[PDB]
């Protein structure tokens, strides 16, 4: 099956285990003392958040080429509550999104594009399609 | 069924409006059977276009009120959905019949107008009977689950059940009885 034929919320959940089943994809050292965006108030609940965000970034790169850090930080941007004043839209964290894209390149999953940006390799499309097939055959969709 | 929509699960045949007045103003069956209580619905265009609306979409519309609920209708469809299943468990009867009986047991048929604290008694139109019933049934669920640990879906079903099983333990039936008593005094 293709990646677009399956529920994406289970796809991210399966790909996160796939990534955190190999031992590769070396995580940063500051994983336990980082807020993930300016507009947040706490650190992520899930202790193994870096693998979920790597799976999310990969499934996002499968759907649009050439994404680059300045768009990953728009894909994860949301609302900020400025206390007593009205709320606004805010960006994600460039450091996190950059380290995630560099850790994916460390897996031969993505490469720097010909136009400036990041893109899946042929070997990454295969790893995403295999997990899509696994998810589809699991839940008998 | 291939030509009879239920609700997904709730059959809309074998549901009896046991009033002669309030029917033709409760659009349950046989032409207004629809899968979801959510249509585009240019029903607020002419005077009486409102009676042709399915009753479940008349409750979904009225339930989203008091400020931080306006326009949140996809939140207000799941409320009715989770409540109908609670109703089917607690009683066993088709959850649409409970709704119809609750709408019948809680619309006042006598009421009073301020005139010339002088009031004069008058009789309620059927459309206003339906409107008052819906408003009263929603306000009870709203006020019951405002600072409780119970959810807006448990209290809506509580209200519908205590109304269809006329008990005066529901906000709507206490209010109906007051309006008709105050109107009987001013008779």
């Amino acid at each position: 099956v293709t990646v677009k034929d399956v529920n994406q919320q289970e796809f991210v959940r399966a790909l996160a285990a796939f990534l955190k089943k190999s031992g590769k994809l070396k995580v940063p050292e500051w994983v336990d003392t980082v807020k993930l965006a300016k507009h947040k108030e706490l650190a992520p609940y899930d202790e193994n958040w870096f693998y979920t965000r790597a799976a999310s970034t990969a499934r996002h790169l499968y759907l649009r080429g050439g994404a680059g850090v300045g768009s990953m930080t728009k894909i994860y941007g949301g609302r900020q509550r400025n206390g007593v004043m009205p709320s606004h839209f805010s960006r994600g964290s460039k450091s996190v999104a950059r380290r995630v894209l560099q850790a994916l390149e460390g897996l031969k999953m993505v490469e720097k594009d010909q136009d400036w940006g990041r893109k899946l390799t042929p070997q990454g499309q295969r790893d995403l399609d295999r997990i899509a097939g696994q998810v589809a055959a699991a839940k008998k969709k | 069924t291939p030509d009879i929509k239920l609700f997904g699960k709730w059959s809309t045949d074998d549901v009896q409006i046991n009033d002669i007045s309030l029917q033709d103003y409760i659009a349950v069956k046989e032409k207004y059977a629809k899968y979801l209580p959510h249509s585009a619905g240019r029903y607020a265009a002419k005077r009486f276009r409102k009676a042709q609306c399915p009753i479940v979409e008349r409750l979904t519309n009225s339930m989203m009120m008091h400020g931080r609920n306006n326009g949140k209708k996809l939140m207000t469809v799941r409320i009715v959905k989770h409540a109908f299943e609670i109703i089917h468990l607690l009683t066993g009867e088709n959850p649409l019949q409970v709704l119809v009986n609750a709408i019948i047991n809680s619309g006042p048929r006598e009421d009073s107008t301020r005139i010339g604290v002088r009031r004069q008694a008058v009789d309620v139109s059927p459309l206003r009977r339906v409107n008052q019933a819906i408003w009263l049934l929603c306000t009870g669920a709203r006020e019951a689950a405002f600072r409780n640990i119970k959810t807006i879906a448990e209290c809506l079903a509580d209200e519908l059940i205590n109304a269809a099983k006329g008990s005066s333990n529901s906000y709507a039936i206490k209010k109906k009885d007051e309006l008709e008593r105050v109107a009987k005094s001013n008779r």
């Binding site: - | 007045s21 004069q120 009789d123 139109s125 059927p126 206003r128």
Partner: protein, 64 residues
Amino acid sequence: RVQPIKLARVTKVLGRTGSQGQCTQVRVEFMDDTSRSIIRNVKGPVREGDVLTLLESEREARRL
């Protein structure tokens, strides 16, 4: 003081009564012997053909 309920069908809309024009004069028959007719003041949006319920049918409406 003890009287049953009476269903009445509307056959004519006369006008809007009350200080704010807030209720309607309506002529009704009695669902049992059509040879009866009374005038009532109804509170809601009444069309012609609707069926009203009367808790007290020995009364009649004067105005206001």
